[PDB]
């Protein structure tokens, strides 16, 4: 009987309870996003990797949900390499930030994909 | 006339004002809870050993009262050695955690025993 660890066990939503994604596994997630004709976008954050509540405590209000946009959503992107290239570009420029890849469905106007693609040292 | 100290005088509820419990004394407390047919359970905490108020300040609300359960309550336990063994196991896995032993009374549904069995260095 194992006791689930309490320390340094922060998670990052979808796919975070699985083993780290290998190069090919990550590329397959991107392929999935593109195959569904969703728009890819990269977001990064250096100061608040996790949700907190500083400005308000009313129902549904949380700080830390918004991250900062890397360039612009990749409208018309049909090649995973492009997304993976931008990811590297973002890493070299923000090696100490958390970086996630999201995919927008413009018809429903809902993010259908969202997973952490990179974590700074210490995580 | 002695002045009661102010610094580094945090307490841990029942038994915390007596000299540190010896191995034999600790075992006697465990015998007691078992003799009363209460269910033993171990709890540990690393980040917040004492109550505080971060999320709310209304009457009766306090953060830090819940610690995390080590495995499950020992239903059917009748051997004190079983409890002390778990204490040692919890201690080795979490050396920097405060660990307490509690005893449940299922009929009244209240903890009839609760005491700190171990505290990290500097406490």
């Amino acid at each position: 009987m194992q006791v689930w660890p309490i320390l340094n066990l922060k998670k990052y939503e979808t796919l975070s309870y699985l083993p780290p994604l290998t190069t090919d596994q990550l590329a397959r997630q991107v392929d999935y996003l593109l195959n569904n004709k969703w728009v890819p976008c990269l977001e990064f954050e250096t100061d608040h990797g996790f949700v907190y509540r500083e400005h308000h405590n009313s129902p549904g209000y949380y700080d830390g949900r918004y991250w900062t946009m890397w360039k612009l959503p990749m409208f018309g992107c049909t090649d995973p390499a492009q997304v993976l290239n931008e990811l590297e570009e973002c890493k070299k420029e923000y090696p100490n930030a958390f970086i996630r890849i999201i995919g927008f469905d413009s018809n429903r106007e809902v993010q259908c994909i969202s997973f952490i693609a990179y974590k700074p040292a210490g995580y | 006339m002695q002045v009661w100290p102010i610094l580094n005088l945090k307490k841990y509820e029942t038994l915390s004002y007596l000299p540190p419990l010896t191995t034999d004394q600790l075992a006697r407390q465990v015998d007691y809870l078992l003799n009363n047919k209460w269910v033993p359970c171990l709890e540990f905490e690393t980040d917040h050993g004492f109550v505080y108020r971060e999320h709310h300040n209304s009457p009766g609300y306090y953060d830090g009262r819940y610690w995390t359960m080590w495995k499950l309550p020992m239903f059917g336990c009748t051997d004190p050695a079983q409890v002390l063994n778990e204490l040692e196991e919890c201690k080795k896995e979490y050396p920097n955690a405060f660990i307490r032993i509690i005893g449940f009374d299922s009929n009244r549904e209240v903890q009839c025993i609760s005491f700190i069995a171990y505290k990290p260095a500097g406490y």
Binding site: - | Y17, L18, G49, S58, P59, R108
Partner: protein, 467 residues
């Protein structure tokens, strides 16, 4: 069945003495200790009590015919002479469920105890016990929280809680009150409290006291790492004032307030109890004035009845006596109403003055509070009599310590924990009590100082209220 109206006076026993009646599980049963005037037979005395506390008056009224009196009348169904007393009887009276207003302790006492105690035909009258049927019990909210929930909110388990009344009773300023409070709390006590008569006065207005006391308790809590409380007294002259005090306490985020239920009254106590339930505030009840009613054996109301009434109206704590302190309280009788306050079921037991079996249908239990003239040497006895589910309070016993409030609290906390440890290890508190305390004095200077001051202090007098 109908009958012709005949004006005139008849004996109460013709309609109200029903020795063949079998009580319904929905009836409120009462045990009265009746002392009739010479010449008044016990059957007539018992019937008068039943009649005038339910449906009858002194002469025949025609209006009885518009209703079904058999269905509503109170009935004296049993009488027994009291041993060791002359011309005294225990009369049992049954009242149907319909006579009472749901959830009103005020209405219940108005009928049962309203006018009958002043009857010319009686020398004295005492209400010893009431059997409250479960159907009526369910109409009350009961304690706003109760034993389990309280321990859970405060995160305190495995030992009696510790309190202390600030002294002097009256005369201290708001700031000095907070000063005394912080010093008491930092030394190990769980609570401190306003004296029962400390409401709002020229020397200390309530709001100032609430404010300074909140600062003091939060400082002591931060210093010790143990949850603290201070019973803020909401007792006031009007419902409106009482409410304004409870409201501010809520605003401060403190865990507990107090109320003098008898001097304040049942109507106001029930209002406060509901507010405490709605707002998460623990409610400590002080029984000021009870002895005016419950001390004499021949006339009045026994405390056990006043205790049951509080459990119904609502209160998380209630003073229960100390047995060994400065105020009267016999051990057997005390243990009797303590079970009636904490348990879900108590069987009829006349050796402890319990006249009827009482069930509570899961109404939360009330925490008995032992306070008044107690000190360190009394710790083993108090721990042995009340057990873990109790609050032991030391006012003079803390502020009377030669080294001050913090050392006084330490002495009390250490004395308690030493008893808890010894008991847990299998030692006999009633036999080894003094030895256990002496052992702790060896390593606790604070406790040693307390022990020497109160060594020869005892309170032993013949009790008036006995069985």
């Amino acid at each position: 069945a109908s009958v012709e109206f005949k004006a005139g006076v008849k004996d109460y026993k013709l309609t109200y003495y029903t020795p063949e009646y079998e009580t319904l599980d929905t009836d409120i049963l009462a045990a009265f200790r009746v002392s009739p005037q010479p010449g008044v037979p016990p059957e007539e005395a018992g019937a008068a009590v039943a009649a005038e506390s339910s449906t009858g008056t002194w002469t025949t009224v025609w209006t009885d015919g518009l209703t079904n009196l058999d269905r509503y009348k109170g009935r004296c169904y049993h009488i027994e002479p009291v041993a060791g007393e002359e011309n005294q009887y225990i009369c049992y009276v049954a009242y149907p469920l319909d006579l009472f207003e749901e959830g009103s302790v005020t209405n219940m006492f108005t009928s049962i105890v309203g006018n009958v105690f002043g009857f010319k035909a009686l020398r004295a009258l005492r209400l010893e016990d009431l059997r409250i049927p479960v159907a009526y019990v369910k109409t009350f909210q009961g304690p706003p929280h109760g034993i389990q929930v309280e321990r859970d909110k405060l995160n305190k388990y495995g030992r009696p809680l510790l309190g202390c009344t600030i002294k002097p009773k009256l005369g201290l300023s708001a700031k000095n009150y907070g000063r005394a409070v912080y010093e008491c709390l930092r030394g190990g006590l769980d609570f401190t409290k306003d004296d029962e008569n400390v409401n709002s006065q020229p020397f200390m207005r309530w709001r100032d006291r609430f404010l300074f006391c909140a600062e003091a308790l939060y400082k002591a809590q931060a210093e010790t790492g143990e949850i603290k409380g201070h019973y803020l007294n909401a007792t006031a002259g009007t419902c409106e004032d009482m409410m304004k005090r409870a409201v501010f306490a809520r605003e401060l985020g403190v865990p507990i307030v107090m109320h003098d239920y008898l001097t304040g009254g049942f109507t106001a106590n029930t209002t406060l109890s509901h507010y405490c339930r709605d707002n998460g505030l623990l409610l400590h009840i002080h029984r000021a004035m009870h002895a005016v009613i419950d001390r004499q054996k021949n006339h009045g109301m026994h405390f056990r009845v006043l205790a049951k009434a509080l459990r119904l109206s609502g209160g998380d704590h209630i003073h229960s006596g100390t047995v060994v302190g400065k105020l009267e309280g016999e051990r057997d009788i005390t243990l009797g109403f303590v079970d009636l306050l904490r348990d879900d079921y108590t069987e009829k037991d006349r050796s402890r003055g319990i006249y009827f079996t009482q069930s509570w249908v899961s109404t939360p239990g009330v925490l008995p509070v032992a306070s008044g003239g107690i000190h360190v040497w009394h710790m083993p006895a108090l721990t042995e009599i009340f057990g873990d589910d109790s609050v032991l309070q030391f006012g003079g016993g803390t502020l009377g310590h030669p080294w001050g409030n913090a050392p006084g609290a330490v002495a009390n906390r250490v004395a308690l924990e030493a008893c808890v440890q010894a008991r847990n290890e299998g030692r006999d508190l009633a036999r080894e009590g003094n030895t256990i305390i002496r052992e702790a004095t060896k390593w606790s200077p604070e406790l040693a100082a307390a022990c020497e001051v109160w060594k020869e202090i005892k309170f032993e007098f013949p009790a008036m209220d006995t069985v």
